[PDB]
């Protein structure tokens, strides 16, 4: 439990949150784990009615896929390693951005992105507000038409 307001957080507060937490390894160091081949390691660092905070440990094999967070704003802090944040572009020229250790970014609830290209041993802290309850997972058929599946997580 942290000293946060009794409400949903905007993306500026979420960014400060992931960084403040990166600066307190005492609360996330023990949850680091790189499954040799299970699923992308999730570790709840704090969950309440207003915020979900996760620690993610990445293998080179991990990819979120194109997705959105419905109504949830979000922030990411790379603790170690580096991630690839891609934002969709109609036309196929998808904007791609390498986010290196020490760096962080945030976004509002309308964000569509994909996290991948994780160098082995990468560690990141992800916070969502309101809590992440439903996501939209996009897919493109062989023909080219795009879909959005609402999923539970």
CA-CA-CA-CA torsion sign (127, 128, 129, 130)? negative
Residues β-bridged to residue 113: 67
Among 33, 60, 95, 98, which residue interacts with a second copy (rule: CB under 8 A)? 95
- Check binding of 153 to a second copy (CB under 8 A): no
Q: What token pair was written down for 74? A: 């979000």
- Minimum CB separation of residue 149 from a second copy in Å reads 5
- Sites for a second copy among residues 22-51 (CB under 8 A): none
Distance of CA 72 to the CA centre of its chain: 11
Residues β-bridged to residue 84: 98, 116
Where is the binding site for Fe cation, in residues? Answer: 67, 69, 113
Residue with Cβ nearer a second copy (38 or 143): 143
Instruction: Write phi, then psi, for 148 (nearest 5 degrees).
Output: -135, 110
> Are the C-beta atoms of 10 and 46 separated by less than 8 Å?
no
- Check binding of 97 to a second copy (CB under 8 A): no
- Check binding of 47 to Mg ion (CB under 5 A): no
Contact residues: Mg ion, CB under 5 A: 48
Q: Residues interacting with a second copy, by CB under 8 A?
A: 68, 70-71, 87-93, 95, 109-112, 136, 139-140, 143-150
């Amino acid at each position: 439990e942290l000293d946060l307001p009794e409400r949903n957080l905007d993306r500026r507060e979420l960014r400060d949150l992931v960084n403040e937490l990166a600066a307190h390894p005492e609360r996330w160091a023990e949850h680091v784990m790189f499954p040799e081949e299970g699923g992308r390691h999730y570790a709840s660092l704090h969950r309440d009615a207003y915020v979900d905070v996760w620690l993610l440990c990445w293998r080179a094999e991990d990819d979120t896929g194109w997705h959105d967070h419905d109504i949830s704003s979000g922030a990411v802090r790379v603790v170690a390693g580096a991630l690839k944040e891609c934002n969709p572009r109609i036309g196929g020229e998808h904007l791609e951005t390498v986010v290196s250790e020490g760096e962080s970014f945030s976004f509002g609830p309308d964000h569509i992105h994909r996290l991948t290209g994780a160098v082995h041993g990468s560690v990141s802290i992800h916070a969502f507000s309101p809590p992440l309850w439903r996501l939209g997972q996009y897919s493109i058929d062989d023909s080219g038409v795009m879909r959005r599946v609402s999923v539970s997580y």
